[PDB]
RNA sequence: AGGAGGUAAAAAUGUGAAAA
RNA sequence: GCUUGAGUCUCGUAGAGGGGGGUAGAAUUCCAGGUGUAGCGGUGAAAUGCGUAGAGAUCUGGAGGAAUACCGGUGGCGAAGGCGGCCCCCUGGACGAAGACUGACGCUCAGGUGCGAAAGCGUGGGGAGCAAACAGGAUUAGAUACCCUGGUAGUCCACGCCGUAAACGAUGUCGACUUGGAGGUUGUGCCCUUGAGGCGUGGCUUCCGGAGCUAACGCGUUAAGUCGACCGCCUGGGGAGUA
């Protein structure tokens, strides 16, 4: 889900304004939260098959976006992976 | 006998037989009705005529019982279904109520598969 | 389900069932689902209903009458 | 739980353990523990009356409170103790006036679930009360037969008794044999099933394990000599005699119910 | 919070002991910040099907916008007491009043 | 074939007793949209109010009690 | 005429080679 | 670097989307009384089965497990398999009017990976009904056959496992492009909300059919029409999808 507030929270925490949500770095960070937003749901119920299908779909959007910013910028990539703690 | 006014005749109408013992809402059961015990075997078991002659032989000597009008509770299709109790009304013995309780479930337990 | 009328009935007089089912839901939904085929038998008679619909539109040609 | 060990040696291969970590790994409560010598199946005459008995590890008798006449005072479950004499684990309870008792452990019992016995306690697993005060259709264990006897039926691990009908002063019970028996409504019963229900899955594995449980080897009938048992003798395996006990009584088919005074209380036969 | 429609109903014998407990559940409704909209004591009308006993039971309606924590509380509260005939909770829809029926 | 939400806005709820019983029948059947001409999205809401009031005992699960 | 109800016993074989 | 590609947020739309937990009534129905006459039963007809202790039948009382009649529809959602009473819980994805935002991050994909009807299988429960294996009566030139009365495993929930199908709209996925009629259809723009609407908008879907195309059948704006990206697959039939 990643409710409206927490989405509107991190954009104002990783970006210039709340309109920076369709900007790349926050586009990444909302999905990183999206994994953690669903980590509890897979800690339970063990059979939500279609629910995990959305998560695997997401991690590609994380990774495919992880290389576009990496492509245009080596340092913003190194910053984003340590501004949040991803890419291992 | 017991000499009462009316009664509650529950008819279990199977695909073969309109089984009805002259019963009551309290369990007082006296006068049987059978589509095989009234003769009529062979093709005549699921025939409406088997039930009608059995239903007149169901209300046999019930005038002495005091009972004239009887609450028919017919359950199922029944071989006669529209003449078994009707000839009893045509003979004169009217019905207080015909409650055709079709036991319709919400499709619970699995039903059989005869006539493969 | 109930056909009584209570004062003026004196006979069965049950066309309520003859106009609704009379044996309909008892002799069909008693058993045997199969869960696979009927929809085609539904649709083929619905195609017959479509054919009943199609034949009603092609009535007016000349017909010699 | 139910664990199977790796085949590191034959005799270790088919073993399945019944490990239960909740059990009190300590020493049992001293004053509730009396001695108990073994017998080897020998009566006052010293003769072996029941065979296949002897040896085994030395065990002590834990005083299991069966009667539960302590009523009105609540009891806190202290700890779940393993028991050698029973088949089910027992529980050490703590009566609120300061008493220690050992009771059978019901199914869903934890270390600290407060229980109560008598007519006052509501329907809860581990509570005990006369059967006229129990809703018919329930499931009990530790059932008395005479009022004040102590409780004889449904004592084994993983058993239970369903109360099926209550006729006045008598109660019909679904006994774990596919059988129904009448009993006085004033008799007490403990609610719920008896815990340690996985005991049935225990596999002894090797021959020595049954030996240290006190069971001494049996001997087949045909392997004996025709003066010690009605079978046997001959060229070996040449049978032809109907299966009989060593004392001439036929086995495999003969009903031996010979009581005559309690058939009034038995409603339905064993299945 | 959720804009739920709590309702229930009650058999006549219980109908005169639930009013003491009506204050108890209205201690729960208002005690969890839940904004009450209806409190409808409709009256003992005849039931559609015989519910645990004969027909003709009293009905009491709530329709309260309350948080989910108390909706968990109330359903669990009737688990130990099947006296008050079961409470059904309906979805949001965001409204307040339709007076009597 | 009636006044619907485009013109006749109406809450399809199980609280309103009138409209709830207007699409039922004595034979234990919600009247289908094939004759009454209701709209489908509201028919699903029309479907829901029956199951809702069946729990409220405004309508039973059978008809004989 | 749109919907509906209503509908019927077991019955087998005839191996080769013949297309202006 | 912008932007019609693509992507994100906002705000409303609907739904058997997934799973977990309660619930309720009916229904074949077992534990029995009441009261009660001889059959019940089944079909092509007969019969083994079955009941005189009193069955079928009878109503009140008690126990469940497993599925949800009408609604329900070439209807919805999901990749597909497939999923259907109700109710709240954590949670999937799509669509829509109109804005702001980064500015080509995409399209497909060997390998690998996951899901994957039923049946079968593994441990444990669970068992009401249905019913393989299994019993019988007959119809029969044969009955391991229809028809017929019993019944186990299975169905069952939880965890595993198998990884097969006519797993099929027998049509791969992605995007552009090319006359229409007539149904179903949900967000949605304007006008008189004057009134059952008029006038559209688009998602998706059903059927008949145009050019074209097709061996023909037919498909036919959801193409099998007109092109492009790329993966997979076939080379006569049997042998064999076997060794």
Short mmCIF file of C-alpha atoms in Angstrom, two decimals, chain E residues 5 47-51 55 86 88 90 101, chain F residues 14-15 52 54-55 57-61 65:
data_model
loop_
_atom_site.label_atom_id
_atom_site.label_comp_id
_atom_site.label_asym_id
_atom_site.label_seq_id
_atom_site.Cartn_x
_atom_site.Cartn_y
_atom_site.Cartn_z
CA UNK E 5 -22.50 0.54 11.42
CA UNK E 47 -38.13 -11.93 13.74
CA UNK E 48 -37.79 -13.42 10.27
CA UNK E 49 -36.40 -16.79 11.45
CA UNK E 50 -36.53 -18.30 15.00
CA UNK E 51 -33.25 -17.13 16.52
CA UNK E 55 -39.38 -14.96 17.27
CA UNK E 86 -24.82 -11.32 17.79
CA UNK E 88 -22.92 -7.37 12.93
CA UNK E 90 -20.96 -2.94 8.46
CA UNK E 101 -35.96 2.42 10.15
CA UNK F 14 -30.35 -2.79 4.09
CA UNK F 15 -31.46 -0.09 6.55
CA UNK F 52 -27.07 -8.25 5.10
CA UNK F 54 -30.70 -12.01 6.34
CA UNK F 55 -28.27 -11.65 9.24
CA UNK F 57 -33.56 -11.14 10.58
CA UNK F 58 -35.54 -8.76 8.33
CA UNK F 59 -35.71 -11.68 5.86
CA UNK F 60 -35.06 -15.36 6.64
CA UNK F 61 -32.99 -17.96 4.82
CA UNK F 65 -40.88 -21.40 10.09
#
